[PDB]
Design an enzyme around this catalytic site. Structure first.
Site, PDB file in Angstrom:
ATOM      1  N   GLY D   6      -2.188   1.383  15.115  1.00  6.94           N
ATOM      2  CA  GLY D   6      -2.000   2.445  14.097  1.00  6.94           C
ATOM      3  C   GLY D   6      -3.043   3.503  14.089  1.00  6.94           C
ATOM      4  O   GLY D   6      -2.762   4.704  14.173  1.00  6.94           O
ATOM      5  N   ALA D   7      -4.246   3.059  13.590  1.00  8.66           N
ATOM      6  CA  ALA D   7      -5.420   3.911  13.352  1.00  8.66           C
ATOM      7  C   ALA D   7      -5.271   4.977  12.309  1.00  8.66           C
ATOM      8  O   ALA D   7      -6.155   5.821  12.028  1.00  8.66           O
ATOM      9  CB  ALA D   7      -5.995   4.376  14.668  1.00  8.66           C
ATOM     10  N   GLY D   8      -4.235   4.838  11.462  1.00  8.68           N
ATOM     11  CA  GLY D   8      -4.055   5.698  10.306  1.00  8.68           C
ATOM     12  C   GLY D   8      -4.816   5.316   9.070  1.00  8.68           C
ATOM     13  O   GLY D   8      -5.908   4.791   9.044  1.00  8.68           O
ATOM     14  N   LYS D   9      -3.973   5.695   7.948  1.00  3.76           N
ATOM     15  CA  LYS D   9      -4.501   5.427   6.627  1.00  3.76           C
ATOM     16  C   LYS D   9      -4.469   3.914   6.230  1.00  3.76           C
ATOM     17  O   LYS D   9      -5.450   3.369   5.710  1.00  3.76           O
ATOM     18  CB  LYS D   9      -3.711   6.314   5.678  1.00  3.76           C
ATOM     19  CG  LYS D   9      -4.453   6.731   4.458  1.00  3.76           C
ATOM     20  CD  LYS D   9      -4.203   8.186   4.069  1.00  3.76           C
ATOM     21  CE  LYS D   9      -4.980   9.171   4.964  1.00  3.76           C
ATOM     22  NZ  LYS D   9      -4.544   9.164   6.416  1.00  3.76           N
ATOM     23  N   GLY D  11      -4.054   1.464   8.426  1.00  3.17           N
ATOM     24  CA  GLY D  11      -4.674   0.876   9.601  1.00  3.17           C
ATOM     25  C   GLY D  11      -6.121   0.675   9.476  1.00  3.17           C
ATOM     26  O   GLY D  11      -6.702  -0.416   9.567  1.00  3.17           O
ATOM     27  N   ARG D 141       1.041  -6.463  -7.960  1.00  2.00           N
ATOM     28  CA  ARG D 141       1.268  -5.321  -8.853  1.00  2.00           C
ATOM     29  C   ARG D 141       1.853  -5.881 -10.129  1.00  2.00           C
ATOM     30  O   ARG D 141       1.433  -5.553 -11.246  1.00  2.00           O
ATOM     31  CB  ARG D 141       2.247  -4.335  -8.213  1.00  2.00           C
ATOM     32  CG  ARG D 141       1.657  -3.562  -7.055  1.00  2.00           C
ATOM     33  CD  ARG D 141       2.703  -2.676  -6.419  1.00  2.00           C
ATOM     34  NE  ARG D 141       2.131  -1.650  -5.548  1.00  2.00           N
ATOM     35  CZ  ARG D 141       2.850  -0.931  -4.692  1.00  2.00           C
ATOM     36  NH1 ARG D 141       4.155  -1.139  -4.597  1.00  2.00           N
ATOM     37  NH2 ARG D 141       2.277  -0.003  -3.941  1.00  2.00           N
ATOM     38  N   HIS D 165      11.604  -5.152  -0.350  1.00  2.00           N
ATOM     39  CA  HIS D 165      10.516  -4.252  -0.696  1.00  2.00           C
ATOM     40  C   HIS D 165      10.994  -2.833  -1.013  1.00  2.00           C
ATOM     41  O   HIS D 165      10.895  -1.929  -0.187  1.00  2.00           O
ATOM     42  CB  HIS D 165       9.482  -4.218   0.437  1.00  2.00           C
ATOM     43  CG  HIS D 165       8.090  -3.891  -0.020  1.00  2.00           C
ATOM     44  ND1 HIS D 165       7.228  -3.120   0.726  1.00  2.00           N
ATOM     45  CD2 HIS D 165       7.400  -4.264  -1.127  1.00  2.00           C
ATOM     46  CE1 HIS D 165       6.066  -3.030   0.102  1.00  2.00           C
ATOM     47  NE2 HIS D 165       6.144  -3.716  -1.023  1.00  2.00           N
TER      48      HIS D 165
END
Lengths: 299, 308, 298, 301
Positions: D6-9, D11, D141, D165
């Site tokens: 990924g390397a995103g948010k 990730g 949640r 989900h």
């Protein structure tokens, strides 16, 4: 700082576990000359290897507990008993003079009896006199169920009430595993088996290793400390002085409660059926006895 | 899993601390029937309160240690008030030998770490009896000496022991010596912050630290060793290649061989990788040489049966 | 409770790290409406999944930080005159609602920012800490260990000067496992690691497009833990000098004892002239940064 | 070794939290050159300050994921979503299948119920090893909003959920408690209906305020998933899994409680649902059924 009164098995187990977490500085206090000082030194060398920057010390001077938020009472005598009432009575005047505004949790057995004596001799409000019972009975029940069903105990919700001893009774109807009701996973036989193992767990160890529990109460004290320090509003079952709750007063019992930064905030009343109120009444009476065996002076 | 051979005072402290960190499952083994099971049980109930999902068992059957990556040896006996130095050595030497045969048969590929004292001599006997390579026979000594040294320097300067870097060498006992020339605090050489009399004061507190607590609470150190084992275990599981001082069987390092000494070494997933040789002065070389003689003297003082 | 002023990328990396260890209740405050609230909210759900009962809030109101014992300023935008104005602003809010707290700035250039924040808040020298040193040392230790094939835990790297281009390490005092760093490395090699350290932050910017955020954050966890425990620990920080190192009225990166009430005392390392020269240049690099700021900001 | 895709948010949040825990070595793999490397470098520097000894690497070469025992897929974007992500999963699935042959994959990409379906089909791995992240975040949640209305720790709340989900996600009051006291007893129907709005609307609330969908909720969830596996805990957590009989459904993915271990899912737990609970579950499955069919056959199978 958190003070520990005891410098014995259960007291050192607690010290070791609390040093690991590093919630606060801890003070070891025990009567036996040099005993607490010597153990504090070894415990300090451990923290130095683990890199836990908390101050750790020992003393034979009870007035050193001056300025403590929480005073963990573990100074009782173990198994191999109600002579622990005198040490509670003797410790009760010391924390009453040097820690009048601290929360005290008793790890001495019989805890329901001991908590009754500490409450009366300290003259402290019921919310700051806590007996360590439920958290341990609950975990043990979680452990036996899990071993039998083959699932982690982290997924078991075990409810227990009564007192910390022979008459401690778990409430299956309110217990479950991963959402599933307990009574829906195990036959009545299997449930009565886990309840024996749970009720007699403490005696079994003694039987096996030679001396009564210490890691259990220790690990339960860690949770209790963490719950107070965070002002978490957690619900745990403790041995507390009753004033009407569950229909009784002028007695001690193991019941669910919301503990905070200032102690017990309120006692929770679980919706019980006639049978469970029967079995809760048996417990109240069991504690009834132990208190009556105590000499009037200690009452 | 991690096997603890002991079910005693240090062994139980080690188990408690290991359960806290949840690094792996841990199995307790001891000769006394019911002792290890009784304890593992109390401990299991403790992990259940803390939520620490691991397994904990106790057994009287040494065959239950097969498949262990690490075997922690703490089974000995500790020095007792008014006690005979040699009246420990021979006793614990016998224990090590006996235990070596069990390790040799059920955990050939495991890394063993000994805490039993005299560690150096015990490490020697265990090394010879198991048939295992150096690299997998580790005696614990230096970490604790270093932490105690750091602790005393700390109390004296009013700074965190975390900010003290103490270098020690030799062996685990009277001839253990620090290297102030190579030590420091927050980046400041120790020889600048402390006079020479003050340094030997802390060296006394350190070398004599173990005896002081035995005389105070009535029994030899156990938490220190235990905490020492926690680090060792974490170092292996992470294959971190940390540098820590350990009593190891020397094969050339520091120009010695066929002997055990407290020296710095890279610890990893398969044991010791290599021993580091600190640059030493004439004086310091003399002190190391003396440390080696103390261990030589301990080893010789054993029966040929236990040392070969 | 720990108040984080920023809600940006370091500030958010700090909140996550600070939430994991459970030290205290944290509070997010940022100018943009909605942002701090919406992140505290996500962060709180993560806290419930892990079981950390700490209290996590978000806010656009700066008066909410009354009663904070520690304020982490992670506001800057990662330039000079801009981050200076931001420091100028925030300084009035801290001065009004958190006079008793220890503020730790992360905003870059830290040294210059630490000066503006000091002058504007009026706070005592020991409670206006600029974050810089911890990070330099960790990087140097990191680079040294990648080359020697040993854990960085085992490396003791000493650094001084300032958080930038003139940041200099003191190999003479640095070590690995007790072995002096110069018996292990050569000139040439010790100069590569230094070069790496000194350029590390810019390299991460080129590679991913934004300036370092986890390093500062992780360093803030240590700083918070040091304060809460009153550990008397020695870490390098960007502090306002009042004579130490033979300078006064300027900020530099130097070793200091940190405790429950902020900086206790600066440690003066026994330096050689060439080292003293290195240090002087560093100071002079910060005086340049400071003299670029308009009079009002300084 | 753990590999993150990924390397995103989400990730990166996962990578930071996994680093704090120090459970194992990390590997970052993303398409953009330099992104994962630089990110792993900033993270590695942070690991050094904390003294967490693990190894942390970045890479653009999926060949590097050889040897992982866990593969975390966070590569998704946050009908113009469904098709893009699905394509993403199929592309990532051929890679995982070839270079992580022995792996347990966990999907944090949304929709999960749809994304787990694809990943399962395209990887060709058994059901045990293709887990979709969803329930752990739904319960936490629901726990959170309960605590907030009662004034008790969420650690003391046992909220049960099922379905899927998204909108059809649905909790089960008569099995959920708080301190051992039954949820139905403490709150009115009205009341429980108020925590559920707060729940099902959370993700949307956080996007609105914060401008971008949840990241931590999932990341922290992945940590629990990783810990449960590494310890062979035999824990019970609600996950999105490919069904083959359970609950009377098959060849579809739904959010259900299962026992997770070192080799994946051991078994799926089948709750004692009433007739209304069952109807609600069918509406959830049906929502997934159409969510998948909205996919090109190329991608679905």
């Amino acid at each position: 700082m958190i003070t520990i009164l005891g410098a014995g098995k259960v007291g050192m187990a607690t010290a070791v576990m609390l040093m690991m977490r590093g919630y606060d500085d801890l003070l070891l206090i025990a009567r036996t000359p040099g005993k607490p000082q010597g153990e504090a030194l070894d415990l300090a060398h451990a923290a130095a290897e683990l890199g836990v920057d908390i101050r750790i010390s020992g003393s034979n001077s009870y007035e050193d507990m001056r300025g403590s938020d929480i005073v963990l009472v573990t100074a009782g005598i173990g198994r191999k008993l109600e002579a622990n009432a005198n040490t509670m009575a003797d410790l009760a005047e010391k924390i009453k003079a040097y820690a009048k505004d601290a929360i005290v949790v008793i790890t001495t057995n019989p805890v329901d009896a001991m908590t009754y004596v500490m409450y009366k001799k300290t003259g402290f409000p019921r919310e700051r006199v806590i007996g360590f019972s439920g958290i341990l009975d609950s975990a043990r029940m979680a452990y036996y169920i899990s071993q039998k069903l083959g699932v982690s105990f982290k997924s078991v919700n075990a409810i227990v009430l009564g007192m910390h001893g022979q008459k401690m009774f778990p409430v299956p109807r309110l217990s479950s595993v991963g959402g599933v009701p307990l009574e829906h996973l195990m036959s009545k036989e299997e449930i009565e088996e886990v309840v024996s193992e749970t009720v007699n767990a403490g005696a079994k160890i003694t039987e096996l290793r030679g001396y009564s529990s210490n890691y259990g109460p220790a690990a339960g004290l860690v949770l209790t400390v963490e719950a107070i320090k965070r002002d978490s509003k957690r619900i745990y079952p403790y041995s507390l002085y009753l004033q009407g709750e569950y229909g009784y007063n002028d007695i001690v019992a193991e019941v669910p409660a919301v503990i905070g930064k200032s102690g017990i905030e309120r006692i929770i009343e679980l919706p019980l059926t006639e049978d469970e109120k029967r079995k809760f009444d048996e417990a109240v009476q069991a504690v009834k006895k132990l208190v009556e065996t105590l000499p009037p002076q200690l009452r």
